[PDB]
Amino acid sequence: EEVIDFSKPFMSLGISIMIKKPQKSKPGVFSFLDPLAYEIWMCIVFAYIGV
Amino acid sequence: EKGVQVLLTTIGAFAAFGLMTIAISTDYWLYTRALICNTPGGLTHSGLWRICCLEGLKRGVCVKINHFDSAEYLLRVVRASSIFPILSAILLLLGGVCVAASRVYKSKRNIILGAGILFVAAGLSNIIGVIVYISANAGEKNHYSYGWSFYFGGLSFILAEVIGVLAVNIYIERSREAHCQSRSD
């Protein structure tokens, strides 16, 4: 701008983050526990013990 | 009788060992389509170690399989080593040897027991190897199929379990005979 003259921006932008699209993750061993949180499983174990 | 049961046990041990060695050495486990076939890809028949192209310009050439996330790494290692089918074959061999010894040291009754334990453990190891193989093949190129080597492994598993059952029955009969003879004496 010190040596030329600009116009008002015709397109405003900024820095941003590019990532690879999340894919269907390869199922993990012990993915059969995913429907319930770990805390539920531990409470189940200790309720079994207590009962 | 006892003799025929022992004969069946030894025959089954030999047959299962042979089938499993054949399946391991053989390279006809999986029929699929692969990118590295010189033209989604070309037909291939694979195994545990090497893969061979069929119906292609590079027909008949067989090349070592290029394997390669901690769990994925461990699975790849176990699949590459194929330690579980090999262990199954080794345990079958040792069980057959123990049976042959039982054909000599007729007094020691805790031998035809080790044979049965080894046969059952071999069946379990074969199950594990099959699971590992199937799991590792999958990734994330269709209409794939399994060959006669895979079913040789399955037959080996079935035979091993059967002969383990027979060996345990033999141990039962022998221990019962000895115990009844002793108590009545």
SS3 labels along chain A: CCCCCCCCCCCCCCCCCCCCCCCCCCCCCCHHHCCCCHHHHHHHHHHHHHC
Cross-chain residue pair B140–A23, CB shorter than 8 Å: yes
Total number of residues shown for chain B = 185
Question: What class is the B2-184 domain?
Answer: mainly alpha
Helix axes B112-137 and B2-25, enclosed angle (nearest 10): 30
Q: Please name the amino acid found at residue B115.
A: A
Residues from chain B contacting residue A26 (CB–CB below 8 Å): 72, 139-140
Instruction: Kindly report the nearest CA distance between residue A26 and chain B, in angstroms.
Output: 7
B130/B70 Cα distance (integer angstroms)? 21
Of B71, B139, B140, the CB nearest to A29: B71
Token couple for B95: 């069980």
Alpha-carbon Rg for chain A in angstroms: 27
Cross-chain residue pair B140–A24, CB shorter than 8 Å: yes
- Reported resolution, Å: 3.4
